[PDB]
Design a protein around this nucleic acid. Structure first.
Ligand SMILES: Nc1ccn([C@H]2C[C@H](O)[C@@H](COP(=O)(O)OP(=O)(O)OP(=O)(O)O)O2)c(=O)n1
Ligand SMILES: [Mg+2]
Ligand SMILES: [Mg+2]
Length: 428
DNA sequence: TAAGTAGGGGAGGAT
DNA sequence: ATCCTCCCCTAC
């Protein structure tokens, strides 16, 4: 109890031990790495020639399911099929990391604050809050990835996240369904009762949309040639990979509030799209509306080893930042460089470019924000330098980081987040 | 109270 | 035209 402050040497350790988002990133980094280690000697690239089917397999409301199966004895009255359940730390402006399908029938979403969520519940319905079980999430994930390997279905299994793989079958030329049913059952068994859904298709996009359509505990096939208006009609605009809130808001402002992908698909033209959301995103949406992948997403198939290679390394801290003087800032920066170099050295690399980035309180914003210890509303400031020679040297990197800070000139009492980045990584 | 980061991509200056 | 820096955005 009593939370470790930002001027304490053990701050990173304690914050990261508690941050589900730090865990997400770490798990992701390590899975990519395990993938490179496991395939150093295997041949990997898929070609133009190849014909393939994608199975996109993902646990259903992952943290909520896993935290329910391991729920402490206090919560035994609790029922997963009948009660709305969230995993979070607090009771007010605290992020819901995962909610079960009961909560989502009230409109509760991942990443909503608890206070916001409880407001959506009618009289007589209670939110149940479960705590994080970081260890168990990882055990379930290992069961998951080992099970997939053990069945002998895929030519490749690309880890995407702690609870999600893109698994590919190379076809040389109805089983697709028997395969989805089998995977689902073996994972439910391997995992002691966690549920996975599957989207299967002949492109990464449609596999992803199919995954959504299948979602609570099911599978869906849909190929490029199965596309109907019924299908497009069932998706919000942000159900496209690569579309999030700001693109959604741009799409709405451009094409008179389409409410589903079918509406969009009916009103859009390429150039209007390109002009709305950028030219590359525009093109990707266009291809997606025809069930087709853009060239960028396809790299993960043609050169897995290149995409999964780590090209940068960083810390990004945006909660609990409160400093009174520059000496504190420097010590924190040094400590952050000690943490990062230890990671640099673990992966046998050096850097030749570094960036410091900071969130500074907006001139308008209250000194204390509604989120307890939160960054509140901020401006970004950013500065990078190329290093003379690739190096892993503390003296060189910490000195330049502290110098990047004086150049941005954010008074310490105004700092509300800090990021330390090694931007280009040179193998030893 | 309450708990990031990798990597695409664009705008605009530099070349 | 093409590259580089400092953002912005999305994912999970
Ligand atoms: N804003 C977010 C989004 C996700 N996650 C964590 C919670 C999830 O359990 C996990 C997986 O991301 P998903 O999008 O897959 O979330 P779910 O698995 O909970 O939902 P779904 O059943 O829609 O896949 O990572 C998080 O902490 N914060
Ligand atoms: Mg999931
Ligand atoms: Mg996922």
């Amino acid at each position: 109890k009593r939370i470790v402050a930002c001027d304490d040497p053990d701050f990173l350790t304690s914050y990261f031990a508690h941050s589900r988002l730090h865990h997400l990133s770490a798990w992701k980094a390590n899975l990519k790495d395990k993938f490179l280690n496991e395939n150093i000697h295997k041949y990997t690239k898929i070609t133009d020639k190849d014909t393939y089917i994608i199975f996109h397999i993902d646990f259903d409301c992952f943290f909520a399911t896993v935290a329910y199966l391991c729920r402490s004895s206090s919560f035994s009255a609790c029922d997963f099929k009948r009660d709305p359940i969230v995993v979070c730390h607090g009771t007010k402006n605290s992020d819901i990391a995962s909610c079960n399908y009961v909560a989502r029938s009230y409109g509760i979403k991942n990443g909503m604050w608890v206070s916001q969520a409880e407001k959506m519940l009618p009289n007589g319905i209670k939110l149940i809050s479960l705590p994080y079980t970081f260890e168990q999430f990882q055990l379930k994930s290992e069961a998951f990835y080992s099970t997939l390997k053990r069945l002998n279905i895929f030519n490749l299994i690309l880890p995407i996240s702690i609870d999600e793989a893109v698994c590919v079958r190379i076809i040389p030329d109805t089983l697709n369904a028997r395969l989805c049913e089998e995977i689902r059952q073996e994972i439910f068994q391997g995992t002691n009762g966690c549920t996975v859904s599957i989207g299967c298709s002949d492109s990464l996009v449609l596999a992803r949309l199919a995954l959504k359509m299948a979602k609570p505990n099911g599978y869906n096939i849909t190929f490029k040639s199965n596309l109907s208006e019924e299908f497009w009609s069932s998706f919000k605009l942000d159900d496209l990979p690569g579309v999030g809130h700001s693109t959604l808001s741009r799409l709405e402002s451009t094409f008179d509030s389409p409410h589903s992908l079918n509406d969009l698909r009916k009103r859009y033209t390429l150039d209007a799209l390109k002009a709305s959301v950028g030219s590359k995103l525009g093109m990707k949406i266009h291809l997606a509306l025809q069930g087709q992948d853009d060239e960028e997403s396809l790299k993960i198939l043609y050169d897995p080893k290149e995409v999964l290679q780590r090209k940068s390394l960083s810390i990004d801290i945006n909660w609990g930042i409160r400093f009174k003087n520059i000496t504190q800032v420097d010590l924190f920066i040094e400590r952050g460089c000690q943490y990062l170099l230890e990671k640099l050295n673990e992966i046998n690399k050096t850097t030749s470019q570094i960036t410091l980035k900071l969130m500074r309180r907006c001139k308008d914003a209250p000194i204390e924000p509604p989120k307890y210890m939160g960054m509140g509303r901020c401006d970004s400031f950013s500065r990078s330098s190329r290093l003379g020679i690739p190096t892993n040297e503390f003296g060189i990197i910490a000195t330049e980081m502290k110098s990047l800070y004086r150049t941005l000139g954010c008074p310490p009492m105004e700092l509300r987040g800090l990021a330390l980045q090694f931007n280009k990584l040179v193998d030893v």
